[PDB]
Amino acid sequence: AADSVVPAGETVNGGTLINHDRQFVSGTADGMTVSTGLELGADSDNNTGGQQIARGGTARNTRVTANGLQDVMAGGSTSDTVISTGGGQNLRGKASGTVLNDGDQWIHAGGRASGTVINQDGYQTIKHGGLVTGTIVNTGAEGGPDSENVSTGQMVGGIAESTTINKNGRQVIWSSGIARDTLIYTGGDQTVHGEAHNTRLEGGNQYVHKYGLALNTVINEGGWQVVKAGGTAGNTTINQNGELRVHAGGEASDVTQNTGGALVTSTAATVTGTNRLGAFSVVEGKADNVVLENGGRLDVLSGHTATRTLVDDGGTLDVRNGGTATAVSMGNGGVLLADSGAAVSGTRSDGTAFRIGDALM
């Protein structure tokens, strides 16, 4: 019902916005508490009230609470907005230091959010043409790898740059989205339907879904890059105690498999790269020179072949009915599983020969 304007060059300190009141900020508004403008929710066209930052205006230390809407127009700016309990920031200008404590931030085309902190139950949605940098993601993956929650955390339909994903943090990259230069700690995860470039798994997980593309993922201790059917990973580095898992119909090309790195796949996947014994490939049902250790595993399916597989400590070679593995080299701690109809031959730890055609060593 009531309406106020902060002209350019003027500054207003404090205040509360309730019952659909509106503050039109062309100057500076510091410490406003915004508790109206979003009563009907984000999917309604009939909301009224809230704080509007026009071109050249600025807001500082704003609190957005339940039903509160801070609307930042192109050319407007905010610093250190704290969003709690079902408030939201609609961003078409610039925001710095926004904290989401179960609040929403929507970044529209041309909007830019730097340093947003997504705390528990917070929700950052980046639309096509929107950009965020330096985001800290602390929520959305509380439920672990089995949780398909996408209602909290960071949803990327535009571009996210320099994101840190901490324990419990979840980033989802939709088909049109791009994440560049992401750091993912243990307990954090990133799901790729769009594109990811330069991702560091410092214990965290990256799931590459159908049509997703992950470029230059570095997998350090505890990290996990999973490539589903129809997903693609290019130029992955598997470091010690990291794992690359490529499902049937998934693709990983130009893999750098360093010593102690685990590769987990089957002969129905497509994998190429180099390991500590040179070039290796799993292509069109034929594996050559795969190195399995420290959790690595290769399933050789019916009609498929593997040659020159090194099964070293913590590696597992699993040859199904109708699969063939020749020149298998068994190291100490390596395991071979051969089902009934499997044909397997090689040499073991001892330099001694063996031939099959259930568990070995």
Numbering used by the authors: 0 to 356, 361 to 364
Q: Can you provide the manuscript's text about this entry?
A:
The best-characterised SAAT, antigen 43 (Ag43), is a protein that contributes to cell aggregation and biofilm formation in commensal Escherichia coli K-12 as well as in major pathotypes including enterohemorrhagic E. coli (EHEC) and uropathogenic E. coli (UPEC). Ag43 possesses a modular domain organisation that is common throughout the ATs, which encompasses an N-terminal signal sequence that directs the secretion of the protein across the inner membrane, a passenger (α) domain that is responsible for the function of the protein, and a C-terminal translocator (β) domain that facilitates the translocation of the functional α-domain to the cell surface. After translocation, the Ag43 α-domain (α43) is cleaved but remains attached to the cell via non-covalent interactions. Similar to α43a 13, the α-domain of all three Ag43 variants folds into an L-shaped right-handed three-stranded β-helix, with each turn of the β-spine comprising three β-strands linked by loop regions.
Crystals of α43_UTI89 and α43b belong to the C2 and P21221 space groups, respectively, and each contained one molecule per asymmetric unit. Although α43a and α43b are similar in size, the α43b crystallised in this work is truncated and lacks the bottom section of the L-shaped β-helix. The α43b truncation occurred during recombinant protein purification with cleavage occurring at residue 415, possibly by a protease mechanism that remains to be defined. Although Ag43a and Ag43b share 86% sequence identity in their respective α-domains, these proteins differ significantly in their aggregation profiles. Unlike α43a, α43b did not crystallise in its dimeric form. However, given the similarity between α43a and α43b, we superimposed two α43b structures on the α43a–α43a functional dimer13 to infer the potential α43b dimerisation interface, which consisted of two interfaces encompassing a total of 14 hydrogen bonds. To confirm if this interface was indeed responsible for the aggregation phenotype of Ag43b, we mutated residues D29, N60, R62, D79 and S95 to glycine (Ag43bmt) and tested an MS528 strain expressing this mutant protein in aggregation assays. Substitution of these five interface residues completely abolished the ability of Ag43b to mediate cell–cell aggregation compared with Ag43b WT, confirming the predicted mode of self-association. Although α43b–α43b trans-dimers are stabilised by a double-interface, this interface consists of only 14 hydrogen bonds. This reduced bonding network results in Ag43b-expressing cells displaying a reduced aggregation profile comparable to that of Ag43UTI89.
